Amino acid sequence: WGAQGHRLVAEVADARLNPTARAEVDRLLATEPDATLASIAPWADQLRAKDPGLGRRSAGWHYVNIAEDNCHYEAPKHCRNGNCIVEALKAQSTILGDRSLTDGERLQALKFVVHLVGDIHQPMHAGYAHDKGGNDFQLQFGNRGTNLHSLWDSGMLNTRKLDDAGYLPLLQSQRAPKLARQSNPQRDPQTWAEASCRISMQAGVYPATRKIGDEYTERYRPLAEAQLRLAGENLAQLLNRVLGA
């Protein structure tokens, strides 16, 4: 997602934390002046942008391209050296839960968990390796040149013309998604990546033309918005497992 998608995932999650995970999240956030679950949600993208070390080391952690293998994940093939979102989210979930670590270490792991639960629910972050998750599929959206990756990260969300305070209750108005009956932080990432991959491969998500507009938005923006709600609810369920147990 773009920044707004990441914030909205965190805002949906923040309201669903159990009292224990509430207190532990607040304790870790207070070690960074003015940090909220929403405000840190885009951080992993700004790091990858600007940081010559962790930014370069974590750039592959935002995605996993499994569409050519029909959305069947294999860690050795699709996540060499743990360099994809499935293994990165598993490892950062373990680090975040490790109460023997410093507040600094666990807050950084929280920033990755908040961001990556967002990104693992963005269909184009689990798509084709060969076109870089739709980045190479250039297309005209209304009168504006963009690409299929950007369309799903922010282009369709931007058409609502809502700030976070307007967009949040819209997402909360949806019927509740069915989650796993129990969080398994080591197994659920593969499930989520595969599900996001299957959406990238659904009929029409890759359009038959390179000029699209209102028809595409009206069909697929509701799916993007369902994915933000699902991501937010899965993030709360994970944080309640890792920090609220």
Which tokens go with 114? 């908040």
Q: Cβ-count burial of 16 within 10 angstroms (0-12 exposed, 13-18 middle, 19+ buried)?
A: middle
Between 78 and 244, name the residue whose CB sits nearer to Zn ion. Answer: 78
Between 14 and 153, name the residue whose CB sits nearer to Zn ion. Answer: 153
Which tokens go with 93? 């979930």
- 211-214 own/partner pairs: CB under 8 Å, 24+ apart: 211/139, 211/140, 212/139, 212/140, 212/141, 213/141, 213/142, 214/142
Please report how close the Cβ of residue 85 comes to Zn ion at its closest, in angstroms.
9
Between 24 and 199, name the residue whose CB sits nearer to Zn ion. Answer: 199
**β-bridge mates for residue 147, sequence order:** 138
Instruction: Give yes or no for residue 62 binding Zn ion (CB under 5 A).
Output: yes
Please report how close the Cβ of residue 58 comes to Zn ion at its closest, in angstroms.
9
By rule CB under 5 A, what string of x and - marks binding of each residue 151-190 to Zn ion? --x-------------------------------------
Measured distance CA(49)–CA(53) in Å, rounded:
11
Please report how close the Cβ of residue 63 comes to Zn ion at its closest, in angstroms.
7
Please report how close the Cβ of residue 37 comes to Zn ion at its closest, in angstroms.
15
Residue from 119, 188, 225, 233 that binds Zn ion (CB under 5 A)? 119
Instruction: Give yes or no for residue 148 binding Zn ion (CB under 5 A).
Output: no
Residue range at the interface with Zn ion (CB under 5 A); choices 23-31, 60-68, 82-90, 222-230:
60-68
Between 3 and 162, name the residue whose CB sits nearer to Zn ion. Answer: 3
- Count of residues in contact with Zn ion, rule CB under 5 A: 5
Measured distance CA(123)–CA(198) in Å, rounded:
8
Please state the length of the chain: 245
Are 135 and 147 contacting, i.e. CB atoms less than 8 angstroms apart?
yes
Number of Cβ atoms within 10 Å of the Cβ of 55 = 15
Instruction: Give yes or no for residue 43 binding Zn ion (CB under 5 A).
Output: no
**Interface with Zn ion by CB under 5 A: which residues?**
1, 45, 62, 119, 153
